Amino acid sequence: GSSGSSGMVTPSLRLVFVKGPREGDALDYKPGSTIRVGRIVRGNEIAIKDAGISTKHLRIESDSGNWVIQDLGSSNGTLLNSNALDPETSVNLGDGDVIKLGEYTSILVNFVSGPSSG
Numbered sequence: 001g002s003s004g005s006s007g008m009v010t011p012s013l014r015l016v017f018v019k020g021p022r023e024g025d026a027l028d029y030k031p032g033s034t035i036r037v038g039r040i041v042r043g044n045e046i047a048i049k050d051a052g053i054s055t056k057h058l059r060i061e062s063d064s065g066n067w068v069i070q071d072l073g074s075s076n077g078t079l080l081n082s083n084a085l086d087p088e089t090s091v092n093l094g095d096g097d098v099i100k101l102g103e104y105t106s107i108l109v110n111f112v113s114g115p116s117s118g
Contacts, residue, residue, distance in 0.1 A: 052102025
């Protein structure tokens, strides 16, 4: 069964589409949930039809109690705020991190901690 409360220290990953074809969209996921961002929905948490994005562009994952991004050697390269990510390198996501992938697709990283305010 198991039915309690439990206190999470990992903030939810909220990908806000600041730019791209989805510009104006936003998603939310739980901590420890890999978010494979690609072009085709097929086997992917998020799919963007910006062309610049490939089926298996990159994948998003967490590390224990943090968020990290990894560029699956995409055909172009991923940008973070103002730095090109690497395939053989993993960076830790933050609060207000802009992910510029594809051609003109930007994703904002927002850490949602707690129930929707209101």
